[PDB]
Structure 1
Amino acid sequence: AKTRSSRAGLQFPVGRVHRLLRKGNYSERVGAGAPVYLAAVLEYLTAEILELAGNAARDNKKTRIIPRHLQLAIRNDEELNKLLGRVTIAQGGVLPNIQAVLLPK
């Protein structure tokens, strides 16, 4: 295991994350665990959303994830929706929601 990603068991790039944390003026010095921890968090969140969007993509009879599927996946998960509360997803559209009083009687 020459790479740090293999040493940490991650698909995300620990070294790049370590670079970004030094070239962003967050602090003087960056700890050796920080870019491992962070990469893992980012990898975790990434997977979770791709899980749900890929599910959305099967319900719509598709091989490919498109912005709509990400939007459906986020705006239906209660926690993902909160994390991305001030977040516009281009080409996402909106969840189907008609108010009760507007339906005929």
Structure 2
Amino acid sequence: SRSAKAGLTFPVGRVHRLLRRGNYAQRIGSGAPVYLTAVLEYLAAEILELAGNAARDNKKTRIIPRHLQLAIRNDDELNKLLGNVTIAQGGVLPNIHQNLLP
């Protein structure tokens, strides 16, 4: 397929239809309409690897939403990318002030 011939796996045609419906431009760039899908695929691979690592850390086979929470929050670059958006049933990294301790 087009993704297979490109080495991709995300459905490019669905995104093409979405962009055509969104009418962000009359004639969208058809030289590489799956490129915007390729960058999203790279970001998704990053976040999925981090989530899988976080889930593996606490001996849980399945991706806990909290596991994804610390996976995204730990990375400073990820926090800069997406920091104004919260995640349902997420959490907060344990941050206790050293001078607060007795």
TM over 0.5, yes or no?
yes
2:77 paired residue number? 79
Query: 4+ residue stretches of structure 1 with deviation over 3 A?
Result: none
Once the two structures are overlaid, the 10-residue window that deviates more, 3-12 or 46-55, is: 3-12
The one-letter amino acid of 2:56's match is R
Determine whether 1:102 maps to 2:100: yes
1:60 paired residue number? 58
1:95 CA drift (Å): 0.6
1:69-91 deviation line (CA, Å, top 9, x unaligned): 11110000111111111110111
Q: Distance in 2 between matches of 1:41 and 1:52?
A: 17
Q: How many residues align?
A: 102
Q: Which runs of 5+ in 2 are unaligned?
A: none
Amino-acid identity (%): 84
RMSD: 1.1
State which of 19, 22, 28 in structure 2 corresponds to 1:21.
Answer: 19
SS at match of 2:23: coil
1:37 CA drift (Å): 0.5
Q: 1:91 to 1:33 in 2, by over 3 A?
A: farther
Q: Is the Cα contact below 8 Å between 1:57 and 1:64 reproduced in 2?
A: yes
Q: Is the Cα contact below 8 Å between 1:21 and 1:35 reproduced in 2?
A: no
Q: Which runs of 5+ in 1 are unaligned?
A: none
Once the two structures are overlaid, the 10-residue window that deviates more, 56-65 or 25-34, is: 25-34
Q: Is the Cα contact below 8 Å between 1:72 and 1:95 reproduced in 2?
A: yes
1:27 CA drift (Å): 1.0
1:49 paired residue number? 47
* Superposition TM-score, scaled by structure 1 size: 0.90
* Superposition TM-score, scaled by structure 2 size: 0.93
